[PDB]
Amino acid sequence: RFLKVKNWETDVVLTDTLHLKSTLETGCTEHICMGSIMLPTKDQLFPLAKEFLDQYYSSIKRFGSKAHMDRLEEVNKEIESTSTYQLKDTELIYGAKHAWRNASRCVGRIQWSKLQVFDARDCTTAHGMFNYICNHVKYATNKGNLRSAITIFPQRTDGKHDFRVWNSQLIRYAGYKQPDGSTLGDPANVQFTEICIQQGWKAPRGRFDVLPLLLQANGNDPELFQIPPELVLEVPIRHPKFDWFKDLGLKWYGLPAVSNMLLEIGGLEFSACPFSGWYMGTEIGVRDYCDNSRYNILEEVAKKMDLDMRKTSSLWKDQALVEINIAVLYSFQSDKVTIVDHHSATESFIKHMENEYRCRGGCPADWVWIVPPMSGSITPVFHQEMLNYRLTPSFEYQPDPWNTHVW
Amino acid sequence: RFLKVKNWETDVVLTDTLHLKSTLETGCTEHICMGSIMLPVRTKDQLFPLAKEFLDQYYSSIKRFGSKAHMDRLEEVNKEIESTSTYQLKDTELIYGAKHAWRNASRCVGRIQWSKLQVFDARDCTTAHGMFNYICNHVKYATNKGNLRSAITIFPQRTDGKHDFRVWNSQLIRYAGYKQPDGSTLGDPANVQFTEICIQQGWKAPRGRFDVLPLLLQANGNDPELFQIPPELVLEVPIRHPKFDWFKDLGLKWYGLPAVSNMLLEIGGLEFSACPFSGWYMGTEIGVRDYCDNSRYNILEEVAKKMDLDMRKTSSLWKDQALVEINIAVLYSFQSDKVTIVDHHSATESFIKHMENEYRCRGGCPADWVWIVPPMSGSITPVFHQEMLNYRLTPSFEYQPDPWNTHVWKG
Ligand code: HEM
Ligand code: HEM
Ligand SMILES: Clc1cccc(CCCNCCc2ccnc(-n3ccnc3)n2)c1
Ligand SMILES: Clc1cccc(CCCNCCc2ccnc(-n3ccnc3)n2)c1
Ligand SMILES: C[C@H](O)[C@H](O)[C@H]1CNc2nc(N)[nH]c(=O)c2N1
Ligand SMILES: C[C@H](O)[C@H](O)[C@H]1CNc2nc(N)[nH]c(=O)c2N1
Numbered sequence: 112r113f114l115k116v117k118n119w120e121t122d123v124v125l126t127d128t129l130h131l132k133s134t135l136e137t138g139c140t141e142h143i144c145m146g147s148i149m150l151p152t153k154d155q156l157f158p159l160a161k162e163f164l165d166q167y168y169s170s171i172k173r174f175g176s177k178a179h180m181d182r183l184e185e186v187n188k189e190i191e192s193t194s195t196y197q198l199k200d201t202e203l204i205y206g207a208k209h210a211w212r213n214a215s216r217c218v219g220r221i222q223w224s225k226l227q228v229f230d231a232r233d234c235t236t237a238h239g240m241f242n243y244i245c246n247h248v249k250y251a252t253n254k255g256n257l258r259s260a261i262t263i264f265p266q267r268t269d270g271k272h273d274f275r276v277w278n279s280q281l282i283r284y285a286g287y288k289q290p291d292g293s294t295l296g297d298p299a300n301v302q303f304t305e306i307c308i309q310q311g312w313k314a315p316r317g318r319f320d321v322l323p324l325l326l327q328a329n330g331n332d333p334e335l336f337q338i339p340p341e342l343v344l345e346v347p348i349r350h351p352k353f354d355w356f357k358d359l360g361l362k363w364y365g366l367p368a369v370s371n372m373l374l375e376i377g378g379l380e381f382s383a384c385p386f387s388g389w390y391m392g393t394e395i396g397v398r399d400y401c402d403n404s405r406y407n408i409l410e411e412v413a414k415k416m417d418l419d420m421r422k423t424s425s426l427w428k429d430q431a432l433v434e435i436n437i438a439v440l441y442s443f444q445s446d447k448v449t450i451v452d453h454h455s456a457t458e459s460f461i462k463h464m465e466n467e468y469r470c471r472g473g474c475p476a477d478w479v480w481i482v483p484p485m486s487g488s489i490t491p492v493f494h495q496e497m498l499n500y501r502l503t504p505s506f507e508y509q510p511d512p513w514n515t516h517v518w
Numbered sequence: 519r520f521l522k523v524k525n526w527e528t529d530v531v532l533t534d535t536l537h538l539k540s541t542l543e544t545g546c547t548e549h550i551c552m553g554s555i556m557l558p559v560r561t562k563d564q565l566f567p568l569a570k571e572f573l574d575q576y577y578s579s580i581k582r583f584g585s586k587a588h589m590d591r592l593e594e595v596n597k598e599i600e601s602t603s604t605y606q607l608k609d610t611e612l613i614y615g616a617k618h619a620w621r622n623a624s625r626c627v628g629r630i631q632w633s634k635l636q637v638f639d640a641r642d643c644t645t646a647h648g649m650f651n652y653i654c655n656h657v658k659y660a661t662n663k664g665n666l667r668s669a670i671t672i673f674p675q676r677t678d679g680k681h682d683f684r685v686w687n688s689q690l691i692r693y694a695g696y697k698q699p700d701g702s703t704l705g706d707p708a709n710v711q712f713t714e715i716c717i718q719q720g721w722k723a724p725r726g727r728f729d730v731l732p733l734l735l736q737a738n739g740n741d742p743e744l745f746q747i748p749p750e751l752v753l754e755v756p757i758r759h760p761k762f763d764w765f766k767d768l769g770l771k772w773y774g775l776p777a778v779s780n781m782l783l784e785i786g787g788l789e790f791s792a793c794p795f796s797g798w799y800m801g802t803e804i805g806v807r808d809y810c811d812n813s814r815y816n817i818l819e820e821v822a823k824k825m826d827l828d829m830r831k832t833s834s835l836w837k838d839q840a841l842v843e844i845n846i847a848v849l850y851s852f853q854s855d856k857v858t859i860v861d862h863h864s865a866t867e868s869f870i871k872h873m874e875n876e877y878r879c880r881g882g883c884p885a886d887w888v889w890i891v892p893p894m895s896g897s898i899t900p901v902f903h904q905e906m907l908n909y910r911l912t913p914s915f916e917y918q919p920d921p922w923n924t925h926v927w928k929g
């Protein structure tokens with residue numbers, strides 16, 4: 112019940128007590144582990160609020176104080192009256208920072224307390240949502256010197272008036288299925304690229320077409336909006352060794368911004384809460400570029416490197432993979448856009464783990480996601496045992512809006 | 519209940535029913551997942567149900583469930599248990615048992631091969647010298663001049679736990695490790711403690727970088743004894759790189775036979791604490807873990823130096839770059855010398871097919887994603903994209919404490 116996690120490269124043992132505050136369920140049982148599975152009322156509300164406010168007030172060293180008790184009563188009064196309640200700006204910022212802190216799949220959490228929270232709860236329309244998003248995009252990009260940020264639209268009321276950003280990321284490339292049977296652009300977005308067109312988008316059918324924003328306010332039908340190109344910073348991908356690499360016509364966007372997730376704070380649900388940080392190199396080079404169901408460019412690059420692709424045992428796929436990722440990091444660094452390599456990031460995460468064990472008694476972490484999709488065992492986190500569990504406040508997944516939207 | 523796993527690269531969805539037959543525990547709960555934790559004497563009371571459950575499986579597999587042969591055997595085992603407090607497995611049951619424990623090894627990527635396992639019955643063994651003889655025959659059969667064959671040798675089961683057979687080596691063939699006075703390590707750092715024991719037990723160490731450890735064998739609860747595996751039985755491969763001619767000059771070699779000797783085989787409640795088994799290597803075992811782990815030979819630096827890599831910033835990915843070449847050299851060398859080896863693409867791809875087959879014919883395939891995914895180039899192998907369920911079936915291979923911590927020394 113007081114658990115220990117061992118790093119097998121350094122012999123460091125940390126003790127975990129934080130897990131004994133976990134409330135939500137993992138998907139696992141004593142008989143079966145689901146660690147690699149991607150997704151395993153008024154009375155409901157107040158204990159949730161209470162748990163949150165207790166944490167908040169303990170974090171500011173006024174646990175059980177006047178203000179604490181006062182606030183507890185105040186919220187309690189509001190819930191009974193209004194069937195919900197509103198967070199104070201202080202609570203909102205704290206909630207959001209702690210949702211990031213608790214996100215067991217994010218490797219970048221050492222930065223957690225340096226989050227810029229944009230309070231967009233006064234927003235009422237999609238145009239409004241568009242304005243708030245552009246401001247977020249411009250602020251976070253910061254001419255290439257990325258700053259972490261989140262923008263928080265109004266909380267769910269009766270699930271009929273939900274704010275949603277339909278895009279999965281604020282900035283993604285389009286996906287077109289060809290008569291050819293092949294697929295142009297990003298295949299992860301083929302369906303989303305479709306719905307953009309069904310609602311009205313004038314697709315230019317290219318390889319790297321920046322998708323439009325598709326914003327839903329107050330439960331209404333969603334609306335399309337083109338992000339000003341001058342706000343979308345992009346990096347052309349070249350290789351500091353292969354002059355031919357540029358001829359591949361590869362580029363990527365600099366701002367990684369998750370927009371499809373649900374932020375839960377003290378029982379309240381924020382269904383539109385786009386957040387952004389900066390890329391770990393492998394996210395683009397390994398996953399976006401090399402996944403079979405994505406841009407899948409390994410064959411092209413290997414062909415261009417003139418490798419023996421006759422045999423898996425030549426490790427040509429591995430060879431190309433490295434070069435590509437060298438290029439990605441190179442291109443971002445040369446255009447002065449923030450990016451972190453998988454070595455630096457994981458190293459920082461181990462440090463963050465030590466801090467969290469020390470100042471908080473633990474750090475929930477999902478090894479399957481923290482370990483980079485290349486060179487796993489030459490990063491420190493490979494040899495680091497982790498305990499995975501769900502704390503609140505949290506970022507949760509939520510259904511794609513098209514499957515739910517009452518048109 | 520039915521459970522679904524999804525491959526996100528192919529959208530193939532599989533349904534697991536097999537997990538219902540799982541009794542042992544995972545270490546996880548509804549509130550915590552211990553999926554990355556490496557490591558989260560038995561009365562007649564608990565033994566016969568275990569025996570029944572095993573024999574029931576056995577008889578089902580041979581399509582004789584409920585037969586007279588089946589019922590008579592259950593009867594025989596029950597009577598033998600209460601009379602003698604234990605029981606003996608038939609040769610057929612032992613073979614079936616050993617294969618199925620490999621089959622259920624959720625951390626093993628090579629299980630497509632599970633049904634082709636040479637089982638050597640060493641239950642008539644009584645002494646360490648007898649253990650050495652058996653182990654030699656294993657090494658020679660499995661090696662087969664480089665055309666490797668999977669094999670397991672099974673020494674007598676545990677009785678009261680005071681008479682255990684144990685192989686003290688973690689692997690039948692491994693290299694010595696020596697801590698120097700200056701704090702550096704010569705040879706394999708993972709074998710420092712074990713090398714020290716051997717030296718203490720009387721081993722005369724050449725003190726080199728690749729000294730094949732002697733065998734330290736414990737029979738019937740007695741103190742362990744040292745034996746040197748005949749060198750001519752130890753197949754080794756010099757590591758060279760197909761383009762880099764300076765690579766040979768690193769002075770690297772490895773052995774061809776990968777053989778786990780410190781695990782415990784459970785079959786029908788019986789405990790076989792000495793059960794060394796061998797397969798063949800997936801390249802990354804040597805190339806990535808053996809050579810490049812910081813706590814192992816750790817050759818990434820010297821290799822990268824000689825590659826003239828920009829080692830000044832980690833964002834040059836010099837480490838990743840060296841890692842690949844080293845793994846290229848390992849596979850190259852083994853194939854050149856015609857010793858069996860498999861690359862991680864080939865091996866993971868076969869495992870996906872094996873897994874799909876197991877769901878269709880068996881209703882499941884327990885699998886530990888944290889272990890199954892190779893330690894380099896994870897997402898360009900198909901297992902990375904494969905959802906897996908992990909649970910514990912018997913028969914099984916289990917960890918057991920190192921015998922130097924538990925042994926009661928005679929003297
Ligand atoms: C600032 C530098 C950051 C870095 C280097 C970073 C890194 C990562 C990486 C590599 C992933 C894996 C994504 C994938 O493979 O799909 C991830 C996921 C995640 N990150 Fe971050 N992140 C950063 C900032 C943030 C911020 C600002 C937030 C929220 C405030 C956040 C919350 C999350 C969450 C909730 C996930 C899980 C996403 C999912 O489950 O699909 N991260 N992060
Ligand atoms: C024939 C080719 C085989 C291949 C390519 C293979 C592959 C692997 C690999 C890569 C591992 C991970 C080892 C590590 O990273 O520490 C492993 C683990 C394991 N294998 Fe195999 N294996 C083979 C044969 C066998 C055989 C014959 C058996 C048993 C009869 C077996 C049983 C196991 C077990 C029990 C583990 C877990 C080891 C542990 O937890 O330390 N494998 N296998
Ligand atoms: Cl459950 C499940 C099943 C299929 C696909 C999936 C997508 C996971 C994508 N995760 C978001 C990736 C992403 C993209 C841009 N930026 C970030 N990002 C930014 C800061 N932190 C993370 N993260 C989930
Ligand atoms: Cl639980 C835990 C914690 C720290 C170290 C540890 C040792 C893992 C060793 N795994 C076996 C490695 C190995 C070596 C040679 N051969 C094989 N092998 C042969 C057939 N299948 C696997 N496997 C366990
Ligand atoms: C099946 C498996 O759970 C799936 O492929 C996971 C593996 N680990 C991951 N890790 C990260 N960081 N991102 C991912 O999308 C995934 N996908
Ligand atoms: C802490 C972590 O679980 C540990 O380092 C695991 C990770 N995955 C592994 N996978 C394999 N094949 N072998 C290992 O030793 C490990 N080590």
Ligand SMILES: [Zn+2]
Pocket residue numbers: 139140143144145146546550551552553
């Ligand atoms: Zn689990």
